[PDB]
Symmetry: C3
Subunit: 264 residues, 3 copies
């Protein structure tokens, strides 16, 4: 006789709407990630902020794929780079004054341009000597700034610093990572990898008290990495899917009405 | 005259169903990944398992952003940390007995807390001296455990061990990575970045034969990195998507029927 | 009276057409990434290209989880590995000739197999001595090749090289990363982590002028890490989604006609 079957029809309808709402809520909480790479023809000269306390910069120069042997390992030489001294106050603690030396970074990644730095510390009471360094994207931005101390204070918190020790040569391969945030901020940051090589001290024994620091800065590759967060929750697609499901259920109900019209 | 056109209609129907099934099967095999970061106000004191064979722990202390200079680089000092000695058997080979010293790690990342350790090895025949260490999440979990040896054996396989060498000071910045998989094991693991600094030996030449090991443990940042695997294949969304496609083909047939008539 | 409301109906139709098309265009530009791991029962013996200028290979051997202590740190020993010398021209600059020594890498990861290498450099004028090395996937592929020089020239650009310094022992843990791209290059590359340990020089003072290089090669784990790029924009799904949306406005309008009737 006459049997009611559409109860299951709107039960399935409500069930589908419930799962659609749950799925949309779940997708709203777990954005996926996307990674891309961008090739550059030349880099913008970065800024390297060095923090030598009493160590004096013996030499600095711009080189290419090979560094010529040092004429004199531990004596003053020629400085052939653009440097800028700055004084500011540590944001972490406002009782310590920080003096930094800013050096232009290399640009020609295609020609494997590099910057070679050599410092000397005469004497100290510490038993683990190292020099702090920080990397920021644009040296020109540092130059044309009404408040250089404020720029340095902001970069102290916005960036992370590393160390290089004496008695070694440290080779640093540096790369750029850009990130797109939900609010739309373009966050640029530095990645870096180090390689340490023992320094063979051939200086006379009278000069062995002084400690030498050697460091090299140059780009790893011309590829800048890009990371973006993609949200896979589109309300209009969900609305269209729900509408299509509702139409399908309505036409299935009409077909069932016809079927029970013939026989049932 | 009368021309049959709906042949293409259900041909397109079968076409769409076939590609929908293929897309669903393909999506079932390639789950996407999602990455999030969680900021903490304080960490849970980790456990550092150290394996010094004959080296003796000269000193250990809890510090902050700067370490004061050593009063004496290579003489016994004061131990100011909580340590626990344990013995167990190596899961990799059940013929070797391992003795470990467990140290409770730093807790406050907001104040940049450090743990500083200094060991001394008197003499040995090896020409490459290093000390093994392992990191696990909770020291309290180790403390309150009916079988500490079983805990160590499980952590030996569940975690990865590293080394720090003599004649250096090693600075280790550690971070926490949580991972969620299909069945829900909520795995937690450690990541590190290490920096080595030469030790300027100013000790008298009579004591130069002994090797000094210095190591520092610190949290890199208060951010824990969470990774999850998201499956983008929803069977019920596909069913509703397939259901809607059939309606258009049926609805267009009536419009096509009117055009024929 | 008679009020026209379907103006909003095809306004919503045009809005829904502009949407999902903006979405398709956006999704075609941002493919998602998928990460998987594959367990192996045994690796394939890699090729290690070493570039010692004047340093002579004192010793090479295949070991397991522990290396026995050296019988003599700085004297010639026994070479117990398969090596092949090759000469070619640097692709970066065609005016320099490069001579490489190819060593067949470790094979079994379940037993923690090691390759141990020891070189000696007698004397040189440089003040920073290091040896270059490069890793490629298959040593057998290198062996059976009509042009070995061309193989090395291709591997120079297709791979990246690292260095290991003298006065240290360098331990290298290496792993394989596979990547699937659009047209199917299935690029395989090497990831590596290093650990340096000070070498305790106990040689007589007369032989201290020579530099000793020690290096160890081992697989980190039996997990090959795979990366794929998934495009989430399916035109067939988009067409079906648009088809369902159009029918909703048509049937709702018919219901609206009944409502005003
Ligand atoms: C930074 O302070 C030092 C104090 O020793 C001073 O000599 C130097 O001129 C200052 N430089 C700048 C840029 O303020
Ligand atoms: C644990 O091992 C150590 C060193 O091997 C030794 O004191 C003894 O065998 C064990 N000690 C205790 C307290 O279990
Ligand atoms: C390859 O180079 C080596 C060293 O430069 C030298 O024996 C010769 O030039 C070449 N040998 C062979 C066998 O091709």
């Amino acid at each position: 006789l006459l049997i009611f079957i559409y109860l299951l029809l709107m039960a399935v309808a409500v069930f589908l709407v419930y799962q659609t709402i749950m799925d949309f809520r779940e997708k709203l909480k777990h954005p996926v990630m996307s990674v891309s790479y961008k090739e550059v023809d030349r880099y913008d000269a970065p800024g390297i902020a060095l923090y030598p306390g009493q160590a004096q910069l013996l030499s600095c120069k711009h080189y290419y794929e090979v560094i010529p042997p040092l004429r004199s390992p531990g004596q003053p030489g020629d400085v052939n780079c653009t440097t800028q001294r700055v004084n500011y106050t540590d944001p972490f603690s406002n009782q310590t004054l920080k003096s930094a030396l800013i050096v232009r970074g290399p640009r020609e990644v295609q020609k494997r341009e590099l910057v070679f730095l050599q410092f000397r510390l005469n004497q100290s009471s510490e038993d683990f000597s190292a020099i702090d360094y920080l990397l920021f994207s644009s040296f020109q931005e540092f130059l044309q700034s009404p408040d250089r101390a404020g720029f340095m204070q902001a970069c102290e918190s916005a960036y992370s610093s590393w160390k290089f020790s004496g008695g070694f040569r440290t080779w640093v391969k540096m790369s750029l990572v850009e990130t797109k945030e939900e609010d739309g901020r373009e966050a640029v940051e530095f990645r870096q990898e180090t390689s340490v090589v023992n320094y063979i001290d051939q200086r006379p024994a009278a000069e062995k008290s002084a400690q030498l620091f050697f460091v090299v800065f140059e780009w790893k590759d011309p590829f800048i990495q890009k990371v973006q967060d993609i949200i896979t929750a589109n309300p209009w697609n969900t609305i269209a899917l729900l509408c299509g499901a509702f139409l399908a259920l309505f036409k299935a109900a009409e077909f069932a009405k016809l079927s029970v019209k013939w026989m049932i």
